[PDB]
Amino acid sequence: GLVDAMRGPTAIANEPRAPLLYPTENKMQPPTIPHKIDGYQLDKDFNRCMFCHARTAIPVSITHYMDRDNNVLADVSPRRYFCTQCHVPQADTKPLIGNNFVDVDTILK
């Protein structure tokens, strides 16, 4: 009369077979990344994301070129430089449990 869908049916004392390592899907919130990012350098010497998403792929929005005082700068702000703190790719797999979240557009119509 209780199951944890994060674990699956396996008793605590036993070890399940690990699911396969799923490939990444090539397809208010930060959009998720609809492509693989495994060969993409992101370090202080080179930001490969900016090769396709710089304001000069849809470009990063103007908020990404703003400093903590909201001044707009000529290049991406250090405060958004490490893109993967906020944007994540998605495994090509279904979620484990339903989630009843409702977004703004839905709640308003």
Binding site: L21, R80, Q85
Partner: protein, 799 residues
């Protein structure tokens, strides 16, 4: 949030539900649903930004399997340890908890009841629970998940400074010239503080970022100097830098002479294992492991002189040139240094000593309590500081740094709680590790877990936790918002209201206490942990829980319940329902008939006011985006112990470490000692465990969010490619990770974000289908009793 009269959404402020950074968010509600959150532009911590977890806060309360009804193991119509769970009413759940706790209190007494709480409790939840156990049941068996986390930091603070929590603040990130990460993975674990380090480094490029770790991770993508070192050798590296400072004549003579003293601690102190473990039988000084003697500066310098470059480089595997680059940043009096550490120092069988030893570096050079010169221990949970440490929800503690062993501290708590003298137990109870051992041994028999998943989180699941929870001598109650493995190992599961389904307060890593209002109603019959503790207290009269000679001291309490004594005591109930802001619900104030959270907070705040821990008036926190304590005359304090910034520091002194009676901070001579369990020929790998950016802890909230689950579905074994080749493994192949205690199964990742040296693997612990704490050892720092989850020895076997 917004002045507007035309939004259809109601936006309100709250702190993030996740890490100790404590970002402020704004939360949008319509028709009882949180439909969006955003980084709060007005919050100073984060100034509008969040990491991916804070951006998906709108989804964490809405997993389809939220708990909605109490569930009790039953067979043939009654409670049964072997039955499967069945829905019962709140009154039935409490009737059973009442019978079980009363039976145990009568037969065994208060050492046989306990609670395992949380740095995710709200301040008033922690305070209400501390009262229920220490003053009500008269049991010091209340400890929190934060024992696994910040107890080495807290022990380090009390030993060096005589008072807990950092003396710098986040403003130091904009002033430092060098950041030194001592194993912290801030990029994933304190992402918005890593944004502030990144802004400082990229905008002021003379700044240096030095990252020390036992494997390479995303902080290395900003590092000027990356150092991979052998587990536990940080103790030797810390002494090497102290020795370098002295050898190069860079001691701040004025600061050291005015403001420090020196001690040498006892050594060979064991590993916090059971007393019959060979490591405990062998240890000379396990019975008083924090003992120290006063020494001179000259003895300190002789002590650290043994940590010379040849010995430290060979022990740590770090080249001498990098040791010197790092020590030079410490030594140069014109470089402001912010040192940062997290579980690499605290989850360490000599973690209290490592805390002391990193303070030594700042104290030798006087780099402390001023902007940018900051030894800054990072806190993990959203309220390990505000709740567990400040309220004192630990087996040895009372509020505001006090300890149950000090009879003046017990007298102060008895005065404020209006208890008869001798109510509060004078001996420390069972701390986290010892609670699982006592459950296994049948000595802890009525147990209530709230806001944690300790079956997944505690080390050595197969040998201690699991046998302990399933022991038929024990009755285990778990309050959770979701099914977890801890609830599956329990006997009674209580559905709990979470985050903005209740009015709350959390205190982050820089002493910022942040409130929120209850913005929505919980589903089904779920109710706050606060409501549950206070409601349960009604079931006990003082005659049932206090001895006659205690009651004789306060005969006005004859016949009253713990609810009367603890919560309806003229203080906790002194703010009426009219004080409740009518714009928000307040489920507990309605249930009990007065402003319970405000009364708890104001009674609790009496401990710290005027005693160095001052909290502002309750209402001020509903107005602000947090205020950093001590709040004195309505002004928050940014740098503690520094004249002109901290109003408790005496004029003319420059600094005063007033937690200590002489006003001086202590510099400790302490050695390198090896881990409890290192690799050998049978178990040739180091196992290191920890987290990834996208999941929180056991994953019960983040792995129920579609986007976070899809971003990182399962734990993996991060392995060096040549180690995999040597075991005949490819990426994606299944292995068992096996220690002397247990095993788990998982797939190899050889090209992921965490890239360990040969001989070492890293496994994150968020996957409830991959219980890595079956493999870890419950060895602890003997002083703080904090578990070392970061190293033990494993074999990796191809499945």
């Amino acid at each position: 949030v917004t002045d507007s009269e035309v939004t259809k959404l109601k936006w309100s402020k709250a702190p993030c539900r996740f890490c100790g950074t404590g970002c402020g968010v704004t939360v949008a509600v319509k028709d009882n649903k949180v439909v969006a959150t955003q980084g709060d532009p007005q919050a100073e911590v984060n100034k509008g930004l969040n990491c991916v977890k804070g951006y998906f806060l709108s989804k964490i309360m809405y997993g389809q399997d939220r708990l909605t009804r109490p569930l009790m193991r039953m067979k043939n119509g009654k409670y049964d340890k072997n039955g499967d769970f069945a829905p019962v009413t709140w009154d039935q759940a409490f009737d059973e908890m009442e019978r079980q706790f009363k039976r145990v209190l009568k037969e065994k007494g208060p050492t046989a009841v306990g609670m395992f709480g949380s740095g995710q409790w709200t301040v008033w939840e922690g305070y209400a629970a501390a009262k229920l156990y220490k003053a009500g049941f008269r049991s010091n068996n209340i400890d929190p998940n934060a024992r696994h986390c910040m107890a080495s930091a807290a022990a380090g603070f009390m030993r060096t400074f005589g008072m807990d929590e950092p003396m710098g603040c986040y403003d130091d990130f904009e002033a430092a010239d060098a950041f030194v990460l001592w194993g912290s993975n801030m990029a994933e674990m304190h992402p918005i503080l890593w944004t502030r380090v990144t802004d400082r480094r990229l905008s002021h490029p003379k700044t240096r970022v030095v990252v020390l770790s036992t494997f390479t991770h995303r902080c290395f993508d900003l590092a000027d100097i990356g150092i991979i070192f052998k587990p536990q050798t940080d103790l030797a590296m810390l002494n090497y830098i102290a020795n370098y400072i002295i050898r190069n004549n860079k001691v701040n003579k004025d600061f050291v002479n005015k403001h420090t003293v020196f001690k040498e601690g006892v050594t060979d102190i064991g590993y916090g294992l059971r007393p019959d473990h060979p490591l405990q039988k062998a240890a000379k000084n396990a019975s008083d492991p924090g003992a120290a003697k006063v020494i001179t500066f000259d003895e300190f310098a002789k002590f650290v002189s043994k940590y010379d470059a040849d010995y430290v480089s060979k022990l740590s595997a770090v080249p001498k040139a990098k040791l010197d680059q790092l020590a030079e940043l410490y030594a140069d009096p014109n470089i402001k240094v912010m040192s940062l550490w997290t579980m690499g120092f605290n989850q360490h069988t000599r973690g209290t000593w490592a805390n002391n030893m990193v303070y030594n570096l700042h104290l030798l050079t006087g780099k402390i309590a001023t902007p940018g010169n900051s030894p800054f221990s990072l806190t993990g949970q959203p309220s390990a500081c505000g709740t567990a440490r400040e309220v004192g929800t630990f087996s040895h503690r009372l509020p505001a740094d006090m300890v149950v062993t000090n009879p003046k501290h017990r007298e102060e708590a008895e005065r404020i709680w209006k208890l008869p003298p001798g109510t509060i137990p004078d001996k420390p109870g069972y701390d986290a590790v010892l609670q699982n051992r006592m459950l296994k041994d049948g000595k802890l028999n009525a147990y209530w877990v709230q806001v944690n998943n300790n079956m997944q989180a505690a080390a050595n699941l197969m040998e201690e936790g699991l046998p302990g929870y399933r022991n038929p001598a024990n009755f285990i109650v778990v309050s959770d918002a979701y099914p977890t493995v801890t609830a599956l190992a329990a006997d009674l599961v209580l559905p709990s209201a979470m985050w903005v389904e209740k009015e709350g307060a959390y205190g982050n890593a820089e002493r910022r206490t942040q409130f929120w209002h209850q913005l929505v109603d919980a589903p089904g019959e779920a109710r706050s942990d606060l409501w549950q503790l206070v409601e349960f207290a009604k079931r006990f009269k003082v005659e049932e829980v206090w001895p006659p000679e205690l009651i004789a001291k306060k005969p006005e309490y004859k016949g009253k319940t713990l609810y009367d004594v603890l919560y309806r005591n003229g203080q906790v109930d002194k703010f009426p329902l009219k004080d409740v802001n009518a714009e928000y619900h307040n489920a507990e104030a309605k249930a009990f008939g007065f402003y319970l959270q405000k009364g708890l907070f104001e009674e609790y705040a009496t401990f710290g006011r005027g005693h160095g821990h001052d909290l502002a008036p309750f209402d001020a926190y509903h107005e602000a985006r947090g205020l950093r304590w001590p709040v004195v005359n309505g002004k928050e304090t940014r740098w503690r112990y520094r004249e002109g910034s901290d109003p408790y520091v005496k004029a003319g002194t420059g600094f005063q470490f007033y937690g200590n009676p002489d006003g001086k901070a202590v510099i400790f001579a302490l050695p390198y000692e090896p881990p409890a369990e290192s690799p050998d020929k049978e178990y040739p790998y180091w196992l290191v465990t920890g987290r990834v950016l996208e999941h929180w802890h056991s994953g019960s909230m983040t792995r129920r969010v579609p986007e976070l689950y899809r971003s990182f579905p399962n734990a993996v074994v991060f392995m060096h490619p040549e180690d995999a080749k040597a075991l005949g493994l490819r990426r994606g192949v299944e292995v068992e990770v096996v220690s002397r205690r247990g095993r788990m199964r998982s797939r190899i990742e050889t090209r992921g974000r965490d890239a360990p040296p040969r001989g070492l693997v890293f496994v994150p612990w968020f996957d409830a289908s991959q219980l890595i704490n079956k493999v870890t050892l419950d060895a602890t720092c003997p002083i703080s009793l904090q578990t070392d989850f970061k190293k033990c020895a494993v074999k990796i076997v191809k499945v």
